[PDB]
């Protein structure tokens, strides 16, 4: 009875980073270190906890946040980092204990002529708080004149898309990202390693 890692990591559709998805896995066995030795993952990095010795450590629940960004932004899914993905899309706390797993998805998330299905927030009036999720479509007022929900000068649609095409550099190619947040509550037990 162990948690569906197979179709969180191999899920066919991934979410856009502004509307990142979260799966809360509970009440199962888990084996993490057949995953720590990547071969498939270009990034597997951990914070507060360490990949070693963790099939022997436990928590009360597991949260799996999954989305897609461009390569040059995977360096932003870490505690204390800045940029428009960390500021306006997905923010990890400074006290983060968990991990970050990322792999290249160019062969399925790109398209010739551009895949415009993956979006990201590029305008917002203030940075996100840790694990906050904003899917507002409100017109962004970048000046003194109000917008009244219609786009114009200094009034912008806050989202924009990536347009992944297979001929891009790896820094602009689609990377699928899954973040695992571990639950320490003073309460019962849940998901553990073998």
């Amino acid at each position, epitope marked *: 009875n162990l948690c569906p890692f197979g179709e969180v990591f191999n899920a066919t559709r991934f979410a856009s980073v502004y509307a990142w998805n979260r799966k809360r896995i509970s009440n199962c066995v888990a084996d993490y270190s057949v995953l720590y030795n990547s071969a498939s993952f270009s990034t597997f990095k951990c914070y507060g906890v360490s990949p070693t010795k963790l099939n022997d450590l436990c928590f009360t629940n597991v949260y799996a946040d999954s989305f897609v960004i461009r390569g040059d932004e995977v360096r932003q899914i870490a505690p204390g980092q800045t940029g428009k993905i960390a500021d306006y899309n997905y923010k990890l706390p400074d006290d983060f204990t968990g991990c970050v797993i990322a792999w290249n998805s160019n062969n399925l998330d790109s398209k010739v*002529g*551009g895949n*415009y299905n993956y*979006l990201y927030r590029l305008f917002r009036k203030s940075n996100l708080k840790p694990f906050e999720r904003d899917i507002s*479509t409100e017109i962004y007022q*970048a000046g003194s004149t109000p917008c009244n929900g*219609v*786009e*114009g*000068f*200094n*009034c*912008y*649609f806050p*989202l*924009q*898309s990536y*347009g992944f095409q297979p001929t891009n550099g790896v820094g602009y190619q689609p990377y699928r990202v899954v973040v695992l947040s571990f639950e320490l509550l003073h309460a019962p037990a849940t998901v553990c390693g073998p």
Partner: antibody
Amino acid sequence: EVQLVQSGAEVKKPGASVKVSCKASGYTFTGYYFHWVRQAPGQGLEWMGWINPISGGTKYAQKFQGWVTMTRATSISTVYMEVSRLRSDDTAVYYCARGHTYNWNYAYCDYWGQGTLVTVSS
Amino acid sequence: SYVLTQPASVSGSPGQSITISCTGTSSDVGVYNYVSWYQQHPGKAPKLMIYDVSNRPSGVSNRFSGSKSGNTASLTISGLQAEDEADYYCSSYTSSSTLVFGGGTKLTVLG
């Protein structure tokens, strides 16, 4: 190279409807707003409106508001200009052009479609 | 029918320089510098000749000059030749993020 390719000419009878297509290629389709501009034969250019490809938000000139609709499909990177219940006033060439950017910056049209002639007669 | 006021016909002889006026309101050519100038040869799509009042796209010959003063933009062609014969439209953005055009100017060259 940036390419805006429009549909072929259309001849229609009054009271019918027409949907001109304009497919973009060679650049990020969501990056720039699109302008629709009509020109009756022998006459000048008339701004019909603009559409934002990623939000679908539109703004029509007051002359064409209500009886014209602009739409887009980013799956195919195409914008559509549809006028229904034609009159013979509507015999004209219809142009799409790439306009300003997502943040309203490069406010001009450098790339135009070849033009679609729509001839409405009984 | 709000359009930028533009002379219907101008002309001039080869080697000389002509200028085409285009007069707007406070709300467009007066407040912003998003004026551009398109050239149309009969039967083809308009070609961007000048943008941002004075800037020429790549490939447009230096003979095409842009200028703006008050509410009146104007386009100057120096060393007029045969193939400059065409329709010329001014256009500009407005303070309500709308686009407007001019009436058009047919330019013929004498001789």
